[PDB]
Amino acid sequence: ADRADILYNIRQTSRPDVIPTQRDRPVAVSVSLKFINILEVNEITNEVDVVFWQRTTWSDRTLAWDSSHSPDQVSVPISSLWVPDLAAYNAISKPEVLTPQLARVVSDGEVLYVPSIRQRFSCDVSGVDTESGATCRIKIGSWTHHSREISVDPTSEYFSQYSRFEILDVTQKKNSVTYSCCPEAYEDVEVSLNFRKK
Amino acid sequence: ADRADILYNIRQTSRPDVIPTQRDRPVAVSVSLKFINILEVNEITNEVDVVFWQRTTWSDRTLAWDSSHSPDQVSVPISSLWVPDLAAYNAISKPEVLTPQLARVVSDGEVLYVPSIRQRFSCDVSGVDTESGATCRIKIGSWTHHSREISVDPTSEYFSQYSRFEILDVTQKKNSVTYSCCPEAYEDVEVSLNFRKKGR
Amino acid sequence: ADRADILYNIRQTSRPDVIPTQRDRPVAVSVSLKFINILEVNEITNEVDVVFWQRTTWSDRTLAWDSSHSPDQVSVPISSLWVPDLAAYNAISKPEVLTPQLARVVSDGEVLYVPSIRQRFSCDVSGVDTESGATCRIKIGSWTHHSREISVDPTSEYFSQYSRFEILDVTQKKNSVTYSCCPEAYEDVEVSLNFRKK
Amino acid sequence: ADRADILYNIRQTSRPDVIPTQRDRPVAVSVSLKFINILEVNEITNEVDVVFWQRTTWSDRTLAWDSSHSPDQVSVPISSLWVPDLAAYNAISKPEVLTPQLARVVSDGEVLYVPSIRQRFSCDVSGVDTESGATCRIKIGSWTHHSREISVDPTSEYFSQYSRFEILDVTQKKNSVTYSCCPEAYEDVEVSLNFRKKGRS
Amino acid sequence: ADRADILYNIRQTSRPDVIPTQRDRPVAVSVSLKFINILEVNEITNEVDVVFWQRTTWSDRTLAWDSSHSPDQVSVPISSLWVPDLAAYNAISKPEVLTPQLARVVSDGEVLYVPSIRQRFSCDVSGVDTESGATCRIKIGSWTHHSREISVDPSEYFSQYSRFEILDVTQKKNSVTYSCCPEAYEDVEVSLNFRKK
Numbered sequence: 006a007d008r009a010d011i012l013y014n015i016r017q018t019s020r021p022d023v024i025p026t027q028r029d030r031p032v033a034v035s036v037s038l039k040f041i042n043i044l045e046v047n048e049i050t051n052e053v054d055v056v057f058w059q060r061t062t063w064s065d066r067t068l069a070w071d072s073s074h075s076p077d078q079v080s081v082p083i084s085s086l087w088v089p090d091l092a093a094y095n096a097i098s099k100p101e102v103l104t105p106q107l108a109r110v111v112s113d114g115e116v117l118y119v120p121s122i123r124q125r126f127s128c129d130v131s132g133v134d135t136e137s138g139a140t141c142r143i144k145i146g147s148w149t150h151h152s153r154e155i156s157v158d159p160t161s162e163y164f165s166q167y168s169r170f171e172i173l174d175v176t177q178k179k180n181s182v183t184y185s186c187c188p189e190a191y192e193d194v195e196v197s198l199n200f201r202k203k
Numbered sequence: 204a205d206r207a208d209i210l211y212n213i214r215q216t217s218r219p220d221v222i223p224t225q226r227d228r229p230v231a232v233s234v235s236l237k238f239i240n241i242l243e244v245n246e247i248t249n250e251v252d253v254v255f256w257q258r259t260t261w262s263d264r265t266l267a268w269d270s271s272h273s274p275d276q277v278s279v280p281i282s283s284l285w286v287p288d289l290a291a292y293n294a295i296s297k298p299e300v301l302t303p304q305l306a307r308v309v310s311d312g313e314v315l316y317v318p319s320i321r322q323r324f325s326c327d328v329s330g331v332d333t334e335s336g337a338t339c340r341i342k343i344g345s346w347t348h349h350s351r352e353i354s355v356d357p358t359s360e361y362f363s364q365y366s367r368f369e370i371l372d373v374t375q376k377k378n379s380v381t382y383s384c385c386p387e388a389y390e391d392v393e394v395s396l397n398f399r400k401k402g403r
Numbered sequence: 404a405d406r407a408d409i410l411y412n413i414r415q416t417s418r419p420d421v422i423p424t425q426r427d428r429p430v431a432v433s434v435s436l437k438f439i440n441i442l443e444v445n446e447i448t449n450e451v452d453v454v455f456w457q458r459t460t461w462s463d464r465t466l467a468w469d470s471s472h473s474p475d476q477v478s479v480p481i482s483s484l485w486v487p488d489l490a491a492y493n494a495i496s497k498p499e500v501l502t503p504q505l506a507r508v509v510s511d512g513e514v515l516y517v518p519s520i521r522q523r524f525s526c527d528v529s530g531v532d533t534e535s536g537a538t539c540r541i542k543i544g545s546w547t548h549h550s551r552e553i554s555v556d557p558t559s560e561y562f563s564q565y566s567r568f569e570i571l572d573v574t575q576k577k578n579s580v581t582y583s584c585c586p587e588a589y590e591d592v593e594v595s596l597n598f599r600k601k
Numbered sequence: 602a603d604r605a606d607i608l609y610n611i612r613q614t615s616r617p618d619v620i621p622t623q624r625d626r627p628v629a630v631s632v633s634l635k636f637i638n639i640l641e642v643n644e645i646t647n648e649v650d651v652v653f654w655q656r657t658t659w660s661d662r663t664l665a666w667d668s669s670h671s672p673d674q675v676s677v678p679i680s681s682l683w684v685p686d687l688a689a690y691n692a693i694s695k696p697e698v699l700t701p702q703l704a705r706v707v708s709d710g711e712v713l714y715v716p717s718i719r720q721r722f723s724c725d726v727s728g729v730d731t732e733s734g735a736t737c738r739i740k741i742g743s744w745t746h747h748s749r750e751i752s753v754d755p756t757s758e759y760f761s762q763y764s765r766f767e768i769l770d771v772t773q774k775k776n777s778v779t780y781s782c783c784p785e786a787y788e789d790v791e792v793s794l795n796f797r798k799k800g801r802s
Numbered sequence: 803a804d805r806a807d808i809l810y811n812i813r814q815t816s817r818p819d820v821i822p823t824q825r826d827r828p829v830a831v832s833v834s835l836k837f838i839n840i841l842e843v844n845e846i847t848n849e850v851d852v853v854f855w856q857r858t859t860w861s862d863r864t865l866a867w868d869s870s871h872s873p874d875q876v877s878v879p880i881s882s883l884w885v886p887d888l889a890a891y892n893a894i895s896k897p898e899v900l901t902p903q904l905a906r907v908v909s910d911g912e913v914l915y916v917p918s919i920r921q922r923f924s925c926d927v928s929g930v931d932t933e934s935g936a937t938c939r940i941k942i943g944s945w946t947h948h949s950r951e952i953s954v955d956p957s958e959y960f961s962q963y964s965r966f967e968i969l970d971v972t973q974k975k976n977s978v979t980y981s982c983c984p985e986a987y988e989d990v991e992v993s994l995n996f997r998k999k
């Protein structure tokens with residue numbers, strides 16, 4: 006098989022609107038943010054403008070193929086695949102995707118999507134001009150799929166040396182969101198960005 | 204039936220351009236705004252820039268399926284469904300949808316759509332820097348469907364603690380709009396946002 | 404017939420790219436602006452930023468149906484219909500349509516489209532801070548269809564009480580535009596907005 | 602034949618992705634800018650924001666029809682026919698088209714497209730607040746078709762009377778661009794906009 | 803064959819989503835930035851806004867045709883072709899393409915795409931107001947294709963009306979590797995040494 010044959014099988018098999026639930030188990034989505042830049046910080050409005058690479062992985066085993074005598078990975082446009090409907094709950098601008106909208110599909114049915122996103126958040130900016138810094142919390146989860154359909158699991162080298170800001174620490178913790186609006190729970194990742202002005 | 208089969212049947216049955224009137228009854232659309240952030244307020248121009256979650260529900264009974272041995276809910280792209288043509292009558296910017304454009308369809312034909320919207324309005328901003336605050340009224344109804352085709356019904360834990368502003372009170376009241384030139388009435392929800400700048 | 408049948412038949416019969424000229428007569432397009440807000444006025448650059456509801460009507464008799472025992476009006480996406488190629492001749496920004504892009508089609512073939520438009524114009528802003536006010540003229544006509552293919556005819560309750568400005572008077576009169584290049588005449592509506600700062 | 606039939610036959614015959622080269626001759630494209638407004642001028646960054654009507658004409662004989670007993674002109678969405686891939690070489694913003702994206706097609710195969718464009722340019726703005734004014738040069742030619750495939754030829758009542766600026770002169774001159782990465786030459790029109798602030802002392 | 807026939811065959815043959823790997827070779831992509839303008843520089847935030855023409859070439863041999871008695875080049879909309887998924891690793895805005903999105907396809911299967919791009923970057927702006935200038939490094943490589951699928955190989959153009967002048971542009975092959983991935987991503991590193999006039 007060549008790349009074309011692997012991509013054709015994926016296009017015939019993949020259902021972009023259908024969550025690939027195995028049995029009645031949630032789809033396990035891994036999310037890991039790598040901060041690249043902090044561009045604009047407003048301590049009065051408590052807003053920050055950041056660039057991050059959102060490493061997103063999950064499994065769709067119907068897409069699997071025998072790669073003993075074939076390429077074991079291909080690039081695929083996301084419009085041909087199911088992709089998790091992730092959103093940042095405290096975003097105040099739409100996510101601006103800076104990179105080509107291609108995913109990698111691995112021969113065992115693993116899918117990998119790593120968009121570069123520039124986006125604006127409402128978060129705690131107090132202490133940014135201090136030694137201890139500000140801690141800005143970013144919450145990322147499925148918008149429409151509760152914990153029984155999608156589970157989200159989190160997993161300095163990447164941060165631009167040319168930022169006015171410096172990263173002290175990034176903490177990524179599993180979490181769940183619930184409102185009076187809904188009987189169900191929505192899993193998220195809580196990303197704590199502890200940073201300060203240089 | 205699996206999710207694929209439910210979504211396939213929805214695609215065969217759904218007519219995104221056709222209002223799902225049951226008999227000839229108006230489609231009852233429930234709208235409920237949850238305020239998340241107030242970003243920009245101008246007391247001189249009487250403009251506000253807000254983020255809100257617009258919880259929108261209605262029923263389309265042709266989408267119903269037997270969920271005895273199937274999932275009773277799926278996520279569906281709104282481009283596959285009829286969605287009410289709601290507009291904010293005092294908006295001065297296009298609604299910016301910040302979330303994935305997916306609805307939930309229940310096996311009994313109930314549809315739920317909850318976009319996060321950032322939008323700019325023309326409204327009364329006087330008193331925002333006072334203790335009693337400003338009251339900004341937002342009016343949301345069907346643009347093209349009068350009261351015989353679409354009825355609109357309204358129904359702190361959501362608001363960002365990091366806003367410069369705080370919410371004193373939110374009131375959502377049914378209302379109707381009618382102009383002298385035309386005989387038809389357009390139902391809307393009137394959302395009264397009573398808020399102020401935090402003191403400090 | 405139900406709404407679905409009327410909309411299906413409209414899709415089969417409507418030719419969105421074909422002007423619905425009856426015989427060899429111009430299509431009569433009726434245009435009526437209702438001013439909602441005046442957001443920005445610049446006396447030095449002679450620019451204004453306005454919101455208006457553009458009530459637009461015309462007739463396409465091929466869309467007609469027997470409504471004796473069916474609904475006599477439906478909402479239709481404008482991408483399914485012919486729409487007049489109207490333009491504001493003194494606009495300096497793209498028209499931002501704020502409302503759903505749906506028209507109403509009546510069973511006799513009358514079409515109604517009322518977009519909410521935010522747009523910026525180059526016009527006479529002198530006297531805006533006086534008691535008599537400024538008179539800003541907006542010209543709206545077909546961009547590509549001369550007077551033999553499209554004719555344009557014009558026809559307090561709407562204006563926001565929260566504007567910094569107030570409307571003294573709005574007058575809408577028929578007009579025709581011609582340039583030294585083109586041998587043909589383009590019909591327009593001339594909308595005179597007499598307004599002032601509060 | 603009625604308008605529907607003419608538009609259907611144009612859809613059948615037109616190849617929007619195929620340059621309509623007659624023989625082995627370049628397609629002769631005529632371009633003529635009419636300046637409507639000058640919105641923003643920055644003498645420090647040497648940037649201008651202008652609105653202009655770009656009268657664009659060419660011929661595509663495979664669109665032709667017998668108009669002895671039918672309309673001799675129709676309006677056509679530009680997505681339905683071939684349009685020249687014109688670009689402004691010194692643009693620093695995308696062209697914002699303000700008007701309906703319709704061309705006029707004549708029964709002899711002549712095509713006319715006149716978008717209203719708002720766009721920002723990098724050009725010489727020095728002298729705008731002087732009596733002799735600034736001369737801002739705008740260069741418009743095919744982006745991908747050299748002089749053997751596309752030739753470009755250029756051809757007061759249009760300019761807004763309400764502008765802060767006044768136009769002293771507009772000159773439109775044929776020209777050719779070449780680079781050392783290319784054996785071929787790209788034809789352009791060079792538009793010299795000589796303008797200044799009104800009401801100086 | 804006329805232009806219509808060549809374009810029709812390209813439309814039938816082209817696979818926009820399939821990297822045109824010949825044999826087991828990485829696709830050799832040649833990238834060359836021509837700087838046209840420097841519009842906005844902020845020495846405090848270390849941001850620049852630039853216009854550049856990105857001359858990009860590669861080969862797709864399935865597109866080849868016999869041009870002995872036909873045109874040997876046509877213009878093709880990029881949406882009909884495979885195009886390398888290049889990204890600027892230090893970009894802080896989307897690339898704004900200012901030009902018609904057309905590639906040239908040559909009868910031997912060579913593809914040429916030269917978009918005009920306006921884009922904002924995070925880079926070293928210190929020294930811009932000095933005689934030796936700032937050196938702003940831009941890194942451009944495949945986002946999703948490692949070195950075994952895509953290989954990247956690198957005055958007349960610059961606007962005389964910029965507030966800035968270019969002292970030197972150096973374009974050097976490079977490779978990017980993270981703990982994130984076992985794989986290496988080839989890039990071009992473009993060093994723009996410029997200063998205020």
Ligand SMILES: O=C1C=C(N(Cc2ccc(Cl)nc2)CC(F)F)CO1
Nearest residue numbers: 060108109117118119945946982987
């Ligand atoms: O986690 C990551 C992977 C990164 N890259 C490779 C990559 C791998 C797979 C996908 Cl679907 N998309 C991209 C970009 C490289 F140039 F750095 C960056 O951050």
Ligand SMILES: O=C1C=C(N(Cc2ccc(Cl)nc2)CC(F)F)CO1
Nearest residue numbers: 148149186191258306307315316317
């Ligand atoms: O009413 C609500 C439901 C909200 N969400 C879940 C949800 C459920 C169904 C749909 Cl169609 N869309 C979204 C977001 C969650 F992350 F909180 C927000 O407020």
Ligand SMILES: O=C1C=C(N(Cc2ccc(Cl)nc2)CC(F)F)CO1
Nearest residue numbers: 346347389456458506507515516517
């Ligand atoms: O003339 C008018 C009719 C208005 N509306 C109803 C309407 C009717 C028909 C169409 Cl095609 N579009 C809209 C909006 C309503 F909320 F008022 C506004 O101004």
Ligand SMILES: O=C1C=C(N(Cc2ccc(Cl)nc2)CC(F)F)CO1
Nearest residue numbers: 546547589654656704705713714715
């Ligand atoms: O040269 C011109 C032609 C202009 N118009 C007529 C026109 C005719 C054909 C086409 Cl394809 N596009 C436009 C607009 C009218 F309002 F004047 C303006 O400037």
Ligand SMILES: O=C1C=C(N(Cc2ccc(Cl)nc2)CC(F)F)CO1
Nearest residue numbers: 744745782787857905906914915916
């Ligand atoms: O390298 C280059 C080629 C340039 N042009 C010609 C061209 C050739 C091929 C392609 Cl696919 N796209 C464009 C633009 C011309 F107007 F100069 C400029 O920079």
